[PDB]
Each structure stands twice: as C-alpha cells, then as structure tokens.
Design an enzyme around this catalytic site. Structure first.
Site, short mmCIF file in Angstrom:
data_model
loop_
_atom_site.label_atom_id
_atom_site.label_comp_id
_atom_site.label_asym_id
_atom_site.label_seq_id
_atom_site.Cartn_x
_atom_site.Cartn_y
_atom_site.Cartn_z
N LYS A 182 0.84 -1.35 -0.22
CA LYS A 182 -0.03 0.00 -0.08
C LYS A 182 0.71 1.18 0.24
O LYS A 182 0.75 1.91 -0.94
CB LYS A 182 -1.03 -0.19 1.12
CG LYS A 182 -1.98 1.09 1.26
CD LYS A 182 -3.15 0.89 0.25
CE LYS A 182 -4.17 1.70 0.79
NZ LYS A 182 -3.99 3.05 0.75
N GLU A 206 10.57 -4.76 4.40
CA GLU A 206 10.94 -5.78 3.82
C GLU A 206 10.72 -5.91 2.15
O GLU A 206 11.40 -6.20 1.42
CB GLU A 206 10.37 -6.78 4.83
CG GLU A 206 10.80 -6.98 6.16
CD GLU A 206 9.72 -6.25 6.96
OE1 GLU A 206 8.99 -5.01 6.69
OE2 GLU A 206 9.46 -6.66 7.99
N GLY A 257 -4.91 -5.57 5.13
CA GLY A 257 -4.03 -6.49 4.64
C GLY A 257 -4.66 -8.00 4.69
O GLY A 257 -4.64 -8.63 3.57
N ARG A 258 -4.92 -8.43 5.76
CA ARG A 258 -5.39 -9.93 6.02
C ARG A 258 -6.81 -10.25 5.48
O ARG A 258 -7.31 -11.36 5.58
CB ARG A 258 -5.33 -10.11 7.38
CG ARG A 258 -6.12 -9.30 8.29
CD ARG A 258 -5.87 -9.56 9.92
NE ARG A 258 -6.68 -8.61 10.83
CZ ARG A 258 -6.11 -7.52 11.14
NH1 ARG A 258 -4.85 -7.11 10.84
NH2 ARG A 258 -6.77 -6.77 11.93
N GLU A 278 -4.47 -12.31 13.85
CA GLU A 278 -3.94 -10.91 13.62
C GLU A 278 -5.23 -9.99 14.04
O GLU A 278 -5.17 -8.85 14.38
CB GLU A 278 -3.25 -10.51 12.47
CG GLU A 278 -2.54 -9.19 12.58
CD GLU A 278 -1.81 -8.79 11.34
OE1 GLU A 278 -2.37 -8.62 10.22
OE2 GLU A 278 -0.50 -8.77 11.48
N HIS A 327 -0.70 -38.19 10.54
CA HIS A 327 0.35 -38.80 10.89
C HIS A 327 1.43 -37.99 11.78
O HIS A 327 2.57 -38.56 11.99
CB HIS A 327 1.05 -39.43 9.71
CG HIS A 327 0.10 -40.20 8.64
ND1 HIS A 327 -0.55 -41.20 9.30
CD2 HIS A 327 -0.47 -40.23 7.54
CE1 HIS A 327 -1.44 -41.77 8.56
NE2 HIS A 327 -1.35 -41.10 7.50
N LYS A 364 8.73 -3.10 15.52
CA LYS A 364 9.43 -2.26 14.49
C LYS A 364 10.25 -1.27 14.93
O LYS A 364 11.17 -1.03 14.31
CB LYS A 364 8.14 -1.70 13.51
CG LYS A 364 7.71 -2.75 12.48
CD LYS A 364 6.57 -2.08 11.62
CE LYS A 364 5.42 -3.18 10.93
NZ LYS A 364 4.25 -2.50 10.46
#
Lengths: 553, 555
Positions: free
Chosen positions: B213, B219, B274-275, B360, B391, B521
C-alpha cells in the site's frame, strides 16, 4: 514413581507458583540483575562449527525458581532415565522395546547391546550401504531402464518417514548436489499426481519408506507410482532400476519388484518420529551427499554427549524441558512456538509438531494411571519474518501466554545485496524478543503520543491500544551458521528436551497407541463408500456425512 | 455503544451458569444416543447456483438444545446482526483507525451502492477489476512483451503479511485451474527467499509484482530493490523496468520513482485490511495464474457467502454458528487453540492463512471503550492438511490432556482421481473416521473386548489396557463441498472472515487494526545501526546486548 502432583519437588514448585506467580516480571529481573544474561545463558563450543548459544534469560524465572526447577529434574530421576536410554534398556515400556535413535549416530562406536548383541556393526553396515548407493546414484553409475543417470529422487512415506527427510533437505538446500528431490506422503492423489507430472520415468528414482512395507497410504502411493512407471517402461523387470525400499520386509519388497539388495533396513528401536538418522535418511544422503549426512549425524552425536555429560544446571535439553514444564504445568500455557529466523528452516516447526506432540500427547503413566496434570503442548510456528507478519499481533497483545523459541544464524548462505537482508533479518530476530520482554507502558506510549503532537482527547482514545504489557518469555538460540552439524545438534537437543519432559510426566514418549482408533474406523468406512446405498451403521453424523458425500460423488 | 463488559452481559451470565452446572455432563455420544434427529438438527446445507451444496455439520459438538439456545441469545445480546449491517453499510467500525471495513465491497457483485466519504466505492472497485482483467489477459496471452520482445514466463509476487499469504494460499489451492505461467512468492526479508527465486528466472521473461500500500514497507521494498538490481544488471536500461515491474499500491509518487509506470499501479483503499485483501488488487497474482474469469468466480463465491451472512437467521447462519461454538469452547471450556484440518493437499496453506486472518484480527486485549479484557479473546489457530496432520499430531488430539476443537473439511470430488478414484476413497474414509473417533472414543470395555479377540495372554491385556482407551467426547465441525473450485473456496474464505468478525463483536474488540506491530518495528530500527558498527553494545537489557555481541563475534 509417585503421581507427579504428590512429588515433593513438584509440590514445592506449586507452592512457590501460588505465592509468586504474579510477582515475577522479566524486565524487573533485568533491572535488578546485571549478571542475568551471564547466569541464564549457555555457550556450547563445537569442534568446527562455532559456538551454540542458548539464551534463556528472557524467562519468568529467578534464582528460587531455577533451583526449584532443577530439583524437579533430580526428583524425577532424569539422569538415571537418560542413562537407561543410552544403555539400551527397554524404556518403551508399553511396546517392551529399547529406544535407540542415539545408536544411529553413535560416532564413537561404543558398544550398545540389544538382545545380547552390539547394534553398532548393524548400524554401520546400513550406513556403508547408504554411502555406496548414494555414490552410485550421484555419480551416474546407477542407470535407469533406458541407460540414463537419475535426475529426480521421490521419497514416498508418511509421518516419520516423510517429515524428517523433507525438513532436513529443505534446511540444508545450500549443500545440495544436482539431484532434485520430491516428497509424497498424503494419500490424497493430488500429492503424487503433482510430483509425477514433473518427472521422466527414465530418470526417476522412487524410495518407498515403510518398515512393514504394508502401510496403507505409502503402499497405495507406491503402487500408483509403479503403475505410472510401467505405462512408460512396459517391462516389469525395469522396476528394480527405479524403486528401492527403506524397510524390513524382504518378501513384500521383492514381490513389489524391488531387488532386496536395494532394501535399506532399520530396527524396532528406531521410532518413526526419531528415524531420519537411520536408513530413513537415504533421500537426505542422496540430496546433499553422504559426507554431509555424516556431519548431520556428527552434530546429533555432539548434542547426545552434551546431554549425557553436562550437569543439569548447564544442560541445554534439561533447561528447555524444565522451562516448558514451568509454563505448561504451572502457568497453564497450552502451546509452544518454534520461530526460526531462516526461510530454509520453514518446515522445522512442522517437524517438531510431530516429534513433540506424537511423543508427549499422552495421558497414561507407567503405572497405568491417568494423569491429573498437563502433558505435551500444541507445538506450532512459522519462520521469521513470515510468522512475524501473520500472527505476532496475538503473541504481543492477545490474552495468551505463548512461550517462543527464536532461532537464528550469524551468517547466511545467501548474502545478497552485500549482506543488507541478513542485517534486517537479525534486527527483527533481536527486537521481537526484546519487545515481548520489555513491552511499552502507559507512560511510555503517552510520552510518544505527546511528542508526536496529538491533542489530549485523541491521545485518550488511542492510548490503551498502544500499551504492550510485555513479560512474555522467549528463548533465543544462535548459531554461527546452519550447517549439517549445527542442524543435527539442534534436532537432537529438541529430541532430548522431549525425552526429559516425558520422564518428568512419567509417560511413554516412544509409543503411539492413539493412532489406532481412527485407523480401525477408516477401514470400516472404506467398503461403505463403494456404492450409492444409504449407510445407517454409525452415529447419525457419520452416516449423514457419508450419504451427503454419496449424493456428490 | 460500548458494550457492557462481556462477563457482565446477562446472556453470557446465563451461559456461565449453565456451563457451571453441566460442563461435566455434556457427552456428545450420549447426545447422539438420545436424539435420532441430531444430525438433522445441527447441520446446515447451503445450495449454490453452480457448485453444489455446502454442508456444515456441527452436530459433533458439546451442545444440546439448551446450550444452542443460550449461545444464540448471546449473539443477540451482543448485537451481531446490527454490527454486521454496520460493516456492510460502510460505517467506520474500525474505531481505533477511524476507518470503514469493506473487504465485502471488493466482491460486491451486485454493484449495490456503498458509501465512503460521500462517494460510492463501487465504480472504484470495478475500475480496478477491469484493469486487472485487461492486464491479466495481456500477460497470459504473450501480448505483453519483455524488454527483448519475449512473452512472460514467470510471475514473482513480492509482499509481506496480507500482501503474500492470501495469494500464495489461493494459488496453491486452485492449482488445477492454472494456465502455463509459473508463480513465485517472495516474502521473507531473509535473502534466501529472493535468492532461491532469482536462480530460476530469466530477466527477459520475468514479471515482478510489488505489493505494498505505502510502497515504503521495509522488507517488501528491500526485496523489490534487490530484484530490480538483478534485473538491471541484465537489462541496463531504466526504461526496461516498466515492462517487468508492476505495483499493487496507492503511492504513485514512490511507485513511479522506483521506475514503474503509474499506468501499471493497481490500487486499493484504506478500508481494505491486509489480511482481508486478496479480493482486491492484491489478488493480481491469482488472476494471472488461473485467469481473470476464475478470479471472478472466487469473488462470486465470497459474495454468495456475504449474502448468506446477511440474510440467514442466526440459527441457520454458518459464520455465526462457528463463531458461537468457538466462544463456547474458548471462553467457557478454556480451550486455547482451534485446528483447521482440510483433507486436501492443494489446501496445504489454508490453516496458515487463517493463522493471520484470525489471530492478527482477534489477538486483542482492549475493548471498544479502552478497557482491558478479563476474558479470553482469539485462540491460537493451527493445522496441517489431512492425512499429513493425521500422521504428525493426532496422537495428542486423541490422547493428550487438551481440548482442541477442530474443523475437518473435504470435497466429494478430487481434481486428481488417479488410480480410478482409489486414493480419494481412502482420503474420505479417514476424513470421516477421524471425527467419528474423536467423538466416540473407546472405553475400557471396548478396548478389552478387542484385546480378548487377539490371542492376548490375559496378563499382557491387563498391562496394555489403559493405554488403549480413548476418552472421546472431543468436538469437531465437518464441512463438505462437492469440489474445491474458485467459487467454493471463495465462499469458505468469506465464511471464516465472518466467523472472525462475529467473535470480535462478541468480545467487543477491534478485529480490524493491528497496533501490536509497532513496538517490534521500532526496536528493530534501533538495533540496525548497532549490527553494523564496531562497538560492544550496551544500550539494551543484558539479553539483547548479549545476543548482539555474540552475533557480532560471529560475523
């Protein structure tokens, strides 16, 4: 062995917890004690891979708590139990079997007796066979049915026969040769189908990983793979150039069309979820070479020696075990997160989700009693920084206590952009644990909002949402670099943590009776899904699901 | 309109009293023994226009008719329906950020007007969709050429969090609908992630999508600039950048300064979390991989579920039902976790995705009024597809000491009916048997009768017996679709979105902010210069210093 809540050491920990739980605050402990990191960190030097640092100082422990925890290890006879394992005693008490994954990496070749015979020559003989085959395949000596070298290796197995090899090949990718490796485990035909579309039958080698050579999912996948193979090759004799087995059943293997010369064996004292160190690691040896597979064994052996020789207060697996018991049995936390800041280690947490949960997700003690205390946690995680941007909101500001292990290397195998990415990766590794410990008080957040020039009313509205309570515990584990050796050492460290917790809880970390019921019930359902007849043999939900699926076949 | 503290809500109190009196007595198997119509009462079939019915079977739960009534009263008391309508109307329900919450507008297939700051967002949403459609067909067709005149062969999404996980998970889930393009997802700041993708690429035929955005995300922008560096090493022409890099973003200044043509910026809006963003421009990698027509069907499936959530009365409203079960187990039984177990290898990242969307959103401790909660909120979400999970960790789900509600999901049809459907029959048998087992368990008598039938010496029977007992009474939801298609996937994603929302409403928390990111951050930014400099570091707590100085000695 007395019920654990009546163990006097456990009682003393309960008393202490009940009186001090709410007063332990990690930041305050750091403020009062300049020696805290030195006291609660362990540096373990290796011969050729640097030091391994375990920093366990950002935990809710002080002097009193640490002593009380060590005393619980002593009262539950952790050391005696360890020595019983390493001596080949039949400590898998429900199956009456030894537990000897440590024998698979017995690099000193010390004698270890099972049924009156040293197992070392057997272990070493399998390793020599793995070494010879690996060289043959890697060098191109081993050829497919049209005379070509192998390009692709496909491991087919479930659980322990899958996760370890998958996790380790992904973790040690920088050490790979030219071979491509593939892993099929799900019965879901998607899993096989998406691998077969990538393959040339002439250059594909399948590894069928199953002791019994009768495991349903693995055999179904194997036979489907063979069927595909023979559509190309036509000749049943060709199966022996393209299929090998990691197994004990020579008859079944031979009947499937594998030369029993290409059956790589292992033993009932190798648990599936502790098996990557055995013949089960053949796909690892093929992908990174045998000499690297040996370094992985060396790392594990190094850690085994640490576990055996280090006094409890300096013994990494014990200390980790004890911290988990602290959070799990006294604070009641249900989960434990594994957060490697290393994308190659993306399947590390999944691997331990099996090694930990299938081992210690138990409720019956050695005396046959049912526990009245918590046993193994839900283990979970994703590598940083990916998990960091998915779920850390809840680790920081949720209602849950989630102990986390943060792991990182000093060095990357991929130092792109002159190292810039790795510095940022490590800054986050460090800062997150710092953040979880230290939090950010009302006063601190308010002072930031003032200094930013927000008006008083807007500040009031937002302020509570900006406060981080902190006091959230972490371990940080640092290596110089993730190499076959340091990875093997770490895997083994967790294996012994898990063992030590099992001993404290007096459960059997080495059986798995809890998979039997679903297996039985699935066998009973199979025939009922073969037609459109209305099924009424179960509870109304199972019946209702079955008939809905029949309407939609 | 803050709500009373939840533990004071009279409907929550009624539940607490009922739990206090009945928690020890509710046994799922017993309830089946006593009610032949149980499956019919506690299941919901939702017919779709073209994708068959979706079945939610919630009958294997620790609920009776009284429990279910009392949970429905809680959703009434907490005003879930009013809160929903507010979301869908564009009200600024993301109260800490003072923003609307309108991922539902991204899939508003009926083009109903939805107002933000006095303007209908529908035209805006539709313009971006039209743009995505044009671009996707250009790339897919080969009409969009690289800087040497070749068609694109590889698409590389670069993004973090919500700008990665959705597209990754959906491309994996819908892989049978893929065209010839290869898709790659770079997210980690760890250089391994980018490096291992770049090794597989030809700069002449790679297209990079930079999803962010602000277009300042550290990152993402570090990854992007490294990719650009690699690219230009080969192309040596700033003009070539615009043929190979596009942006999912609204900062045209920063996009264009990076070298991307603003014509190739695909925008979204601040009311897109975002999510919750895969439905927006963020989904461009999905549109590219499986084609725009398939992306629209994904949108159609979510819209279909949005309509269900709006129109279904509470007692037949799947998101609300799933939300209320989760509050029962979480807030009353105290279970910390919730497992998502799709019996579908394509869906291997589904649980991972909802780790973010759920945790979140609802990993929160401050209410709408600013008060700290004194009750549990979001659980730890986790899982692996069946039968892999089976398993790995089901030993613990069956025989550990923990209550772990699980959602099992499966399709009636596979996209890969190899060996004449034989794998899918086995797959399904396991999907059905596992929940049957968790519910029924196996008593001492059942276990002993089996052991008797093996030639087991009574001595050995006695010693193994307690280990063979299963307590049962472990709850599950079972969700079945005809097939996992774009539509059915979209419907299921939206369903869980609305579960999460309804729980947030009940808890009186903000499902839509994420203030918890900030401390980490800020602390990382401070550490960055310290990793570079020569000195012994002493500015932090002893642990952080100790870790820094150990790293520095191993550089």
């Amino acid at each position: 062995k007395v019920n654990l809540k009546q163990d006097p050491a456990y009682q003393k920990l309960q008393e202490y917890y009940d009186n001090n739980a709410d007063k332990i605050n990690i930041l305050q402990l750091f403020q009062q004690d300049a020696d805290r990191f030195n006291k609660y960190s362990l540096r373990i030097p290796t011969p050729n891979d640097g030091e391994i640092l375990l920093d366990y100082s950002k935990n809710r422990i002080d002097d009193t708590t640490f002593s009380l925890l060590l005393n619980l290890a002593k009262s539950r006879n952790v050391e005696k139990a360890r020595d019983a394992m390493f001596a080949g005693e039949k400590i898998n008490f429900t199956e009456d079997r030894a537990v000897l994954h440590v024998a698979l990496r017995n690099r000193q070749n010390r004698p270890i007796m099972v049924n009156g015979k040293d197992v070392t020559p057997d272990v070493n003989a399998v390793l020599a066979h793995m070494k010879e085959f690996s060289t043959q395949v890697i060098s191109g000596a081993w050829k497919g049915y049209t005379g070509k070298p192998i390009t692709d290796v496909i491991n087919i197995g479930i659980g322990g026969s899958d996760l370890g090899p998958l996790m380790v090949t992904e973790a040690l990718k920088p050490y790979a040769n030219h071979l491509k490796v593939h892993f099929v485990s799900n019965i879901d035909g998607t899993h096989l189908a998406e691998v077969l579309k990538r393959l040339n039958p002439e250059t594909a080698l399948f590894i069928i990983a199953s002791k019994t050579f009768t495991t349903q999912e693995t055999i179904t996948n194997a036979t489907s793979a063979k069927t595909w193979f023979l559509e190309a090759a036509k000749d049943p004799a060709a199966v022996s150039k393209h299929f090998v087995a990691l197994s004990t059943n020579g008859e079944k293997v031979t009947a499937f069309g594998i030369d029993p010369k290409n059956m790589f064996g292992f033993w009932d004292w190798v648990g599936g979820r502790y098996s990557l160190w055995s013949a089960i690691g053949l796909s690892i040896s093929l992908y990174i070479g045998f000499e690297n597979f040996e370094k992985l064994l060396d790392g594990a052996n190094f850690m085994d020696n640490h576990f055996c020789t280090a006094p409890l207060e300096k013994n990494a697996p014990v200390i980790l075990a004890l911290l988990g018991v602290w959070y799990g049995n006294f604070y009641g936390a249900e989960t434990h997160a594994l957060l490697p800041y290393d994308q190659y280690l993306h399947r590390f947490a999944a691997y331990f989700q099996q090694g930990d949960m299938e081992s210690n997700g138990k409720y019956v003690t050695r005396s046959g009693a049912t526990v009245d205390y918590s046993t193994g946690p839900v283990v979970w995680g994703e590598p940083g920084t990916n998990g960091q941007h998915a779920f850390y909101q809840l680790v920081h500001q949720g209602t849950r206590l989630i102990p986390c292990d943060f792991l990182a290397p000093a060095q990357t195998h991929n130092p792109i952009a002159n190292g810039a990415h790795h510095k940022i990766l490590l800054a986050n590794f460090l800062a997150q644990t710092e953040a979880l410990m230290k939090g950010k008080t009302d006063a601190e957040a308010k002072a930031e909002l003032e200094k930013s020039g927000m008006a008083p009313e807007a500040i009031a509205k937002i302020l509570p949402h900006k406060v981080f309570k902190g006091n959230r515990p972490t371990n940080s584990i640092v290596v110089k670099k993730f190499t076959p050796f340091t990875l093997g050492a770490l895997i083994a460290m967790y294996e012994h943590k898990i063992f030590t917790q099992g001993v404290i809880w007096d459960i059997n970390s080495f059986d798995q009776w809890g998979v039997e019921l679903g297996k039985q019930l699935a066998k009973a359902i199979e025939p009922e899904l073969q037609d459109g007849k209305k099924i009424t043999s179960h509870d109304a939900s199972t019946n209702g699901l079955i008939n809905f699926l029949k309407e939609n076949f």
